Amino acid sequence: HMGASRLYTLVLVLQPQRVLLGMKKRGFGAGRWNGFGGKVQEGETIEDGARRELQEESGLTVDALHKVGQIVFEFVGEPELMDVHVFCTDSIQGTPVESDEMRPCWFQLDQIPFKDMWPDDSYWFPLLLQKKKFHGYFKFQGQDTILDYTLREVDTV
């Protein structure tokens, strides 16, 4: 996937029988449940950015984040690809609380609200839930339509 890309993070708190999602309240993807995350800033590592965004959006801190995936997004007409680094943790510190950006809620693993999530999630979530590492690519036309996609399992994220 050639071209300048912009680094983002996505963090899924995934425990044995539940997963934490945030309802995005403003900005990009508002009105959909997602993992926690954002742009990676100058002067922080990708993992530092993931932690930062988890704290900003949910108040939670974490001992260890694990790399579980990479998803590259093309938005038709937008020059930069989005290079999203996906992370998982089971253990968390604190109780999740609402932020300006996100309203947190736990979901049982058989009640994941896919119809109110970004449409790409239904493709790669099953791999996340199976503990399989993956590389994904999705080309979107606007916010609702996937024109192209690829998805595979990887041994190294």
Ligand SMILES: COc1nc(N)nc2c1ncn2[C@H]1C[C@H](O)[C@@H](COP(=O)(O)O)O1
């Ligand atoms: C298009 O399909 C997509 N599907 C999913 N599941 N997540 C996506 C996504 N596009 C972007 N993100 C994620 C990355 C970031 O966590 C956040 C954006 O950063 P903020 O604008 O909220 O600061 O949204």
